[PDB]
Design a protein around this ligand. Structure first.
Ligand SMILES: Nc1ccn([C@@H]2O[C@H](COP(=O)(O)OP(=O)(O)OP(=O)(O)O)[C@@H](O)[C@@H]2O)c(=O)n1
Ligand SMILES: [Ca+2]
Ligand SMILES: [K+]
Length: 430
DNA sequence: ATGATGACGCT
DNA sequence: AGCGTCAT
């Protein structure tokens, strides 16, 4: 009752760019705009691997991981943009720089947590409180929420998508208590107004469209963002959670998409997030551990406490290349040349990072895979990163992995290497 | 022969 | 430290 927390203390938004890599290429090349198109890397094996897909192309069944030769069988007019290749490997610099453009814009509105190349969480609690004061109780016009969906509405006693959307928005606004400044539903609505403004600024200043979710925590904001894509935003209120979760497959909630979520389903004999409410917290802790059990107990009620962490820059800077099947590295010369290739790209990115961001990495992580292992990584070793010098970094990487060579011959490498990875970590201010 | 990333938990 | 999970 009066002491039962409802997890309505914050306003959190998740902003996610639509078909990011595709939009980056379509901004650069206007011939790709408003067309079925995809982004592909490499080209020789089966036309290249598709890594991003425009919504027009998704209508034909094109998906990520598809070989482009196979995507062309579903969508013969599919247009393709190729990832840049430098020093023999895919180079994602264009997308990292486009990401910085977006993140710097969102940072004007609030402190962000950079979750990925194209996603950021925003804690809007303070900004909402401010905007509510600037209001002083005037109602919020539907005109301020032109691309907002209210999940769960319309409901109660038109056949077009936008008609639905407006009907739900009208019901939501008509029931709002704009007089109470601590009403959570009011706070979410003002949050959504701000997110409309943020999304308009991103589009105005970059050309890029995005979707967003607005709720009271990160999991609900992420789920919300996915409900109405592309180019729309969705508000998921605390009150909408019971119905939303009642048919929500457990795997759709962030962190439950893998083995843990599969075990929740199998051990408890359930399918949907809402079914978790019927277990005590101690029961869930007994099955899934103290941390996971408490998290599930709260999360299935719409409650989660993970803070939006103030972090706009990535914590690691890594360079990786696979050498699949027949191309696995079988000579010391090969291993050494590719370590140098990776190390040169890493040196370039590290020097740029140090000039831009006033920090220096202090640890170099080297990771390899040997032919035969089902695990993505077969060995990971660290060494000191004392100088931004590619030849030194590649020599140190070789020193820390060279005893993996089963070969009795000095020149050969066995088993051959199917993956090389160099990662700079443990940043210090400079 | 998906590939190239990136954050965080466990021991 | 080194490995694994989960995600873009
Ligand atoms: N396995 C994956 C995943 C992502 N990505 C990259 O991260 C970007 C954002 O990932 P995403 O949000 O999951 O997908 P999206 O392309 O933005 O499309 P949308 O968000 O559904 O509109 C993609 O554009 C790139 O394809 C990559 O490389 N491999
Ligand atoms: Ca996206
Ligand atoms: K994303």
């Amino acid at each position: 009752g009066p002491h039962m927390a409802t997890g309505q203390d914050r306003v959190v938004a998740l902003v996610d760019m639509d078909c990011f890599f595709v939009q980056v290429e379509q901004r650069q090349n206007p011939h790709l705009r408003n067309k079925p198109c995809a982004v592909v890397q490499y080209k020789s094996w089966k036309g290249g691997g598709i890594i991003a897909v425009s919504y027009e192309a998704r209508a034909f069944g094109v998906t990520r991981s598809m070989w482009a030769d196979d995507a062309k069988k579903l969508c013969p007019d599919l247009l393709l943009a190729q990832v840049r290749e430098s020093r023999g490997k895919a180079n994602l610099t264009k997308y990292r720089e486009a990401s910085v453009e977006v993140m710097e814009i969102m940072s004007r509105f609030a402190v962000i947590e950079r979750a990925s190349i194209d996603e950021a969480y925003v804690d809007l609690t303070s900004a909402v409180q401010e905007r509510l004061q600037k209001l002083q109780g005037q109602p919020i016009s539907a005109d301020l929420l032109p691309s907002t969906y209210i999940e769960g509405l319309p409901q109660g006693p038109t056949v077009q998508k936008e008609g639905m959307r407006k009907q739900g928005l009208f019901q939501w606004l008509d029931s709002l208590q704009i007089d109470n400044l601590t009403s959570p539903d009011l706070q979410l609505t003002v949050g959504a107004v701000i997110v409309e403004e943020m999304r308009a600024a991103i589009e105005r200043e970059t050309g890029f469209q995005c979707s967003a979710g607005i709720s009271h925590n990160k999991v609900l904001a992420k789920l919300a963002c996915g409900l109405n894509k592309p180019n729309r935003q969705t508000l998921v209120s605390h009150g909408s959670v019971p119905q939303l979760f009642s048919q929500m497959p457990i795997r759709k909630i962030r962190s439950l998409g893998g083995k843990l979520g599969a075990s929740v389903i199998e051990i408890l004999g359930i399918e949907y997030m809402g079914e978790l409410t019927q277990f005590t917290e101690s029961q869930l802790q007994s099955h899934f551990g103290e941390k996971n059990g408490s998290w599930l107990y709260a999360m299935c009620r719409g409650i989660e406490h993970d803070p939006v962490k103030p972090r706009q820059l990535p914590k690691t800077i890594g360079c990786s290349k696979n050498f699949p099947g027949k191309t696995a590295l079988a000579t010391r010369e090969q291993v050494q040349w590719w370590l140098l290739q990776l190390a040169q790209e890493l040196e370039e990115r590290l020097t740029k990072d140090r000039n831009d961001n006033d920090r220096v990495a202090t640890q170099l992580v080297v990771s390899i895979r040997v032919q035969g292992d089902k695990r993505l990584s077969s060995l990971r070793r660290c060494c000191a990163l004392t100088r931004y010098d590619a030849h030194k970094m590649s020599h140190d990487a070789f020193t820390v992995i060279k005893n993996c060579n089963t070969s009795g011959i000095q020149t050969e490498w066995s088993p051959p290497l199917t993956m090389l990875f160099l990662c700079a970590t443990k940043f210090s201010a400079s």
